[PDB]
């Protein structure tokens, strides 16, 4: 029988290239623009990925759409943190193999202020020495981190699916012997990082929503992101979001 985490591991999507021509100089506008086009391709891959997570397709189609709309930024930022954490010990952002933002590229105007919220994720993964298995359980949990004010059409089932992946995160923590007040502290620490993603996403979405809405900025978003953003902007103004937390 295959374990649940091994099933999350085989569906881990391939690395996408940004298509960034480095023979041309950098600019903040050029990088932000390239990243949005990459972001849309990465979100399309996250849809294919979500559909293969055991249990996810059993939710009402409207709930599948809802979870993907609420969590896309959280999934994008968490996965970027992982790639950055695995790339080097240095303070870099590995957006793609052809677009790595080093300390020299961070000197670009307004670059550091958007990049620091993203650098926090890899910093926490380095500091907590997060494993591949813990990451895979945590990333699936980030997909199930927000729900509508009045919940989902398959809420009962969602709470069951969510519980299963919380238990799965527990199993990965224990697999790193370990035991026992040491384990409770690992669960505390990792679920605290999961909770802080809501704050990371809030900062990322402020940039995202502003650059989308202000057409004088000339910052393009592909169909995939434009659609999700158009749908999500009113949901953040009508309080139609219940951000799930492990620690109150």
């Amino acid at each position: 029988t295959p374990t649940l985490v091994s099933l999350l591991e085989v569906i881990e999507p391939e690395v996408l290239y940004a298509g960034y021509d480095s023979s041309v100089p950098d600019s903040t506008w050029r990088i932000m623009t390239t990243l949005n086009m990459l972001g849309g391709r990465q979100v399309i891959a996250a849809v294919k990925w979500a559909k293969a997570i055991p249990g996810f397709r059993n939710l009402h189609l409207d709930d599948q759409m809802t979870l993907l709309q609420y969590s896309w930024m959280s999934l994008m930022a968490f996965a970027l943190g992982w790639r950055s954490y695995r790339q080097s010990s240095a303070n870099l952002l590995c957006f793609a193999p052809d677009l790595i933002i080093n300390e020299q590229r961070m000197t670009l105007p307004d670059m550091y202020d958007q990049c620091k919220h993203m650098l926090y994720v890899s910093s926490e993964l380095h500091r907590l020495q997060v494993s591949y298995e813990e990451y895979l359980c945590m990333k699936t949990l980030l997909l199930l981190s927000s729900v509508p004010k009045d919940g989902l059409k398959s809420q009962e089932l969602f709470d069951e699916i969510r519980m299963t992946y919380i238990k799965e995160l527990g199993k990965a923590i224990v697999k790193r012997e370990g035991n026992s007040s040491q384990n409770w502290q690992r669960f505390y620490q990792l679920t605290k990082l999961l909770d802080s993603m809501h704050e990371v996403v809030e900062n990322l979405l402020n940039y995202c929503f502003q650059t989308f809405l202000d057409k004088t900025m000339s910052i393009e978003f592909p169909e995939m992101l434009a659609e999700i953003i158009t749908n999500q902007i009113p949901k953040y103004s009508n309080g139609n979001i219940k951000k799930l937390l492990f620690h109150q």
Binding site: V47, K48, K51, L61, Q64, M65, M224, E227, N231
Partner: peptide, 13 residues
């Protein structure tokens, strides 16, 4: 309406 997202969930793959 989330046309692309619905399409990607409804399509095969």
């Amino acid at each position: 309406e989330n046309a692309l997202l619905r399409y990607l969930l409804d399509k095969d793959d």
